[PDB]
């Protein structure tokens, strides 16, 4: 055997909606100061350190929760005095920061600047999607699915099918936001939305609002699975001619595999 | 021992025929339940018997002439290869592979280890100029078949199979290569992730299972050669398309 190694502290940023960064109000290291969304930038209030104990903090003031109950907001306060439980946090690969003891997750009701955060009933929504990283800049990529074809974005409220890969067509240029949402690079206003949680449900390019549908988890197996409904996006009956990508119970088949190629 | 093996004939070969091939190659070397975030972690010397110590790769060139290269199940490394009663082993070559791989052929060892730097120095060139693809693959297998197998052709294979086996990025890069029947040269990214297998390896085992942030950072490289530091797993996957993790440390 060969035990791993206890990781030291590291300072990484936090984002999860409209490309907004999580930080402290006015960067005041004083206790009680709540947390809120705000345009990223080089600043301590935006900087966050993660520890093995399971505590995130900036300015040296543990980032703990204020009051425990679905609906309570977040703020920073001394580690020592901080509630043993209201200070620990969990960051799964599902792009979510859930508070162990309670079970709630860092939620962002509205993705507006200066919007305070708050723990809430985890329901798998873009609002409850966060990605810890120093690179607050998303990556451009084309979703090459079935028959080496790339996923294409048509018009607003319209569908989305597999079209001949073209590293020039912006309709194929997909932008993956840290909020676990897939929005069109050309126009990051609309996000890949679903039309339900039942099999065969049609997918489209609706607007971004944090809906549970706008949440997409990229399963390591190569399938882009929807969090709310375990269904995954694929090509209906494999017939790309049908012009439609929909949600469907996992099968582990190639018609459900998707690759994300750089710019 | 009659180690298992997979095949891939360039002739009448389609993009899907290649993808499926790599998939099968993965289903072998990638066993055991030691995995994180879904991605498997290649076993280690201790947890592996000689009976399943190596895997054989079969590549049939256009002219039917097929060459086989055995990979090490403990790292997807190209241990060796054979061709018409002929076997070759890098300057290293352990008695383990020398006395269990292609038994019956001439065991004449080359003069350079399988290390990327070693091959490049022997081919007089570097990966950044050894274009790979359908035709480039043909010349590779062929060269290894007749010429006896040089360094250049060898590098062409490694990146085309084991490399594309751990990184789906190189996979689609090749899947599109045969699709358009055109060749291509390794960019700064593909090469970058190609040298950060061990690094990103422990950087993913460190965070642990179902964890996004990394205890450190992976030094990747963009087309413009600029540094691309990935701090989270979601990023590493969405770019390197990794699907195989090498052992470095165990869960805690
Ligand atoms: C995806 O779409 C976004 C926009 O929704 C693109 O963001 C920005 O795009 C511009 C234009 O390429 C980049 O440069 C700009 O150049 C002009 C002309 O010199 C200048 O006036 C602007 O101030 C800007 O520098 C810009 O760097 C880029 N991103 C950022 C953060 O500025 C993005 O480029 C698109 N991605 C792809 C792959 O096309
Ligand atoms: O809460 C929103 C936003 O507040 C800023 O606070 C101050 C800032 O510290 C000061 O330098 C500037 O002159 O006025 C701001 C008024 O809000 C924080 O700097 C910023 O990080 C956000 O936290």
TrEMBL record, chain A:
Superkingdom assignment: Eukaryota
Binding site for beta-D-galactose 1: 23-24, 26, 36, 45
Domain Ricin B lectin: residue ranges: 8-133, 137-261
Cystines in this chain: 21-40, 62-79, 150-165, 191-208
Binding positions for beta-D-galactose 2 per the UniProt entry: 23, 26, 36, 114
Binding-site residues for beta-D-galactose 3, renumbered to this chain: 235, 237-238, 253, 255-256
Family per similarity comment: Belongs to the ribosome-inactivating protein family.
Record's subunit section: Might form dimers or tetramers of disulfide-linked A and B chains.
Known function: The A chain is responsible for inhibiting protein synthesis through the catalytic inactivation of 60S ribosomal subunits by removing adenine from position 4,324 of 28S rRNA. The B chain binds to cell receptors and probably facilitates the entry into the cell of the A chain; B chains are also responsible for cell agglutination (lectin activity).
The protein's name in its UniProt record: Ribosome-inactivating protein
Protein species of origin: Sambucus ebulus
Span of the entire protein shown here: 300 to 562 of 564
């Amino acid at each position: 055997g060969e035990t791993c190694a206890i990781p030291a502290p590291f300072t990484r940023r936090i984002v999860g909606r409209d490309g907004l960064c999580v930080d402290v109000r006015n960067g005041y290291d004083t206790d009680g100061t709540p947390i809120q969304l705000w345009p990223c930038g080089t600043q301590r209030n935006q900087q966050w350190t993660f520890y093995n104990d399971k505590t995130i903090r900036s300015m040296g003031k543990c980032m703990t929760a204020n009051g425990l109950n679905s609906g309570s907001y977040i703020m920073i306060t001394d580690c020592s005095t901080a509630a043993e439980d209201a200070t620990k946090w969990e960051v799964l690969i599902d792009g979510s920061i859930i508070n162990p003891s309670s079970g709630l997750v860092m939620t962002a009701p509205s993705g507006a600047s200066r919007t305070t955060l708050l723990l809430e009933n985890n329901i798998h929504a873009a609002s409850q999607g966060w990605t810890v990283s120093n690179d607050v800049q998303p990556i451009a990529t084309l979703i090459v699915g079935y028959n080496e074809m790339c996923l294409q974005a048509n018009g607003e409220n319209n569908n989305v099918w597999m079209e001949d890969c073209d590293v020039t067509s912006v309709q194929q240029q997909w932008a993956l936001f840290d909020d676990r949402t897939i929005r069109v690079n050309n126009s990051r206003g609309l996000c890949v939305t679903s039309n339900g949680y039942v099999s065969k449900d049609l997918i489209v390019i609706r607007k971004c609002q944090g809906l549970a549908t706008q949440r997409w988890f990229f399963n390591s197996d190569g399938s882009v699975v929807n969090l709310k409904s375990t269904r995954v996006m694929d090509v209906k009956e494999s017939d790309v001619s049908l012009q439609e990508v929909i949600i469907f119970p996992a099968t582990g088949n190639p018609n459900q595999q998707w690759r994300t190629q750089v710019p | 021992i009659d180690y298992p093996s997979v095949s891939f004939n360039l002739a009448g070969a389609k993009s899907t025929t290649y993808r499926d091939f790599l998939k099968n190659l993965r289903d072998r070397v990638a066993t055991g339940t030691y995995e994180v975030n879904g991605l498997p972690v290649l076993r280690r010397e201790s947890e592996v018997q000689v009976k399943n110590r190596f895997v054989l790769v079969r590549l049939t060139n256009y002219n039917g002439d097929t060459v086989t290269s055995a990979v090490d199940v403990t790292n997807l490394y190209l241990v060796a290869f054979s061709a018409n009663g002929n076997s070759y082993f890098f300057k290293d070559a352990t008695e383990l592979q020398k006395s269990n791989l292609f038994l019956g052929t001439t065991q004449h060892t080359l003069s350079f280890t399988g290390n990327y730097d070693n091959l490049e120095t022997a081919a007089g060139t570097r990966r950044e100029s050894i274009e790979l693809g359908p035709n480039p693959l043909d010349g590779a297998i062929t060269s290894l078949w007749y010429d006896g197998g040089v360094a250049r052709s060898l590098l062409v294979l490694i990146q085309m199979v084991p490399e594309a086996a751990r990184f789906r990025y190189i996979e689609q890069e090749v899947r599109r290569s045969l699709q358009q029947l055109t060749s291509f040269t390794p960019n700064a990214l593909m090469l970058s992730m190609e040298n950060n297998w061990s690094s990103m390896s422990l950087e993913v085992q460190l965070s642990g299972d179902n964890v996004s942030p990394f205890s450190g950072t992976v030094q990747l490289q963009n087309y413009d050669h600029t540094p691309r530091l990935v701090d989270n797993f979601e990023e590493l996957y969405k770019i390197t398309g990794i699907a195989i993790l090498l052992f470095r440390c165990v869960a805690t």
